[PDB]
Amino acid sequence: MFDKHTHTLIAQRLDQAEKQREQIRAISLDYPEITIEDAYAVQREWVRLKIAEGRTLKGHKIGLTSKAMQASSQISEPDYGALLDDMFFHDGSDIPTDRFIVPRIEVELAFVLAKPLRGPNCTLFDVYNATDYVIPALELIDARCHNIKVFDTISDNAANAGVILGGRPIKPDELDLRWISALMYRNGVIEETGVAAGVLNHPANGVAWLANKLAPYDVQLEAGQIILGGSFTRPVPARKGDTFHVDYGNMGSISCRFV
């Protein structure tokens, strides 16, 4: 583990990259010995910096869930990152393309917590008990590091950039979350489809997993937090002028336009 000052330095470079819309060199190429522990430390530092700047923690995401599951990927488990208030866009919003560098849209479910969730022994059942509503959610992911590597993604707040909630809120017991499915349209054509079971076999699993990862840091998932569980589609690039419409069937839809 690098010393605190190195983590802060890396975080400040990611911050400037995000604000300037100018990518930096992959952190792992400049810091060949970086570990996963370092990457989460850098993330913590960046998030700390951004909250100091006037942002507020609103929740967390779990990512690389598809890659953790795929036999072909060397990724062995999910990543996580922190969701801040300024990342949220309303359903039907115009999204400022110029804010982002290489934005892509992916399709998720979100858990809105009525009660806190704390590890180390958090289960799926705890998640069900603590969840007020499940709601469809799009994630807008981005990269502050050049991709000419998991350590780079994690350092870079797990690729976080935007979240768009919409559709129909449901109580968790209302229907089988595993069979929620979606069609992602971009510019009028279906680009990806998927089913929620594709997220770790049950889209609530990542929420328990996450609570358990945060416990050693004396961190819990707080009541009121929104937790994105992971994408069940591949991400699709968003370019200026693109309209997205994601149809979750009887769970409603989420749309936006890049301007």
Q: Where are the beta strands (DSSP E) in the chain?
A: 57-63, 79-84, 88-90, 93-95, 104-113, 131-141, 160-165, 181-186, 189-195, 226-228, 236-237, 243-247, 253-258
106 marked as binding residue: yes
Smaller CB distance to its own copies: residue 11 or 177? 177
Whether the CB-CB separation of 223 and 113 falls below 8 Å is answered with yes
Say how far apart CA 19 and CA 67 lie, in whole Å: 29
Of positions 168, 212, 219, 222, contacts its own copies by CB under 8 A: 168
Whether the CB-CB separation of 249 and 181 falls below 8 Å is answered with yes
174 marked as binding residue: no
Of positions 95, 134, 141, 177, contacts ligand OXL by CB under 6 A: 141
In whole angstroms, the minimum distance from the beta carbon of 234 to its own copies comes to: 9
Residue 92's binding partner, choosing from Mg ion, ligand OXL, its own copies, none, with beta-carbon cut-off 5 to 8 A by kind? its own copies
Say how far apart CA 118 and CA 218 lie, in whole Å: 9
Residue 256's binding partner, choosing from Mg ion, its own copies, ligand OXL, none, with beta-carbon cut-off 5 to 8 A by kind? its own copies
45 marked as binding residue: no
**Distance of alpha carbon 258 from the chain centroid:** 19
Smaller CB distance to ligand OXL: residue 108 or 152? 108
**Is residue 139 close enough to count as binding ligand OXL by CB under 6 A?**
yes
Smaller CB distance to its own copies: residue 11 or 180? 180
**Is residue 147 close enough to count as binding its own copies by CB under 8 A?**
no
Report which residue's Cβ sits closest to Mg ion: 139
Whether the CB-CB separation of 192 and 236 falls below 8 Å is answered with yes
Site of interaction with Mg ion (CB under 5 A): 63, 139, 231
**Binding-site annotation, residues:** 106, 108, 139
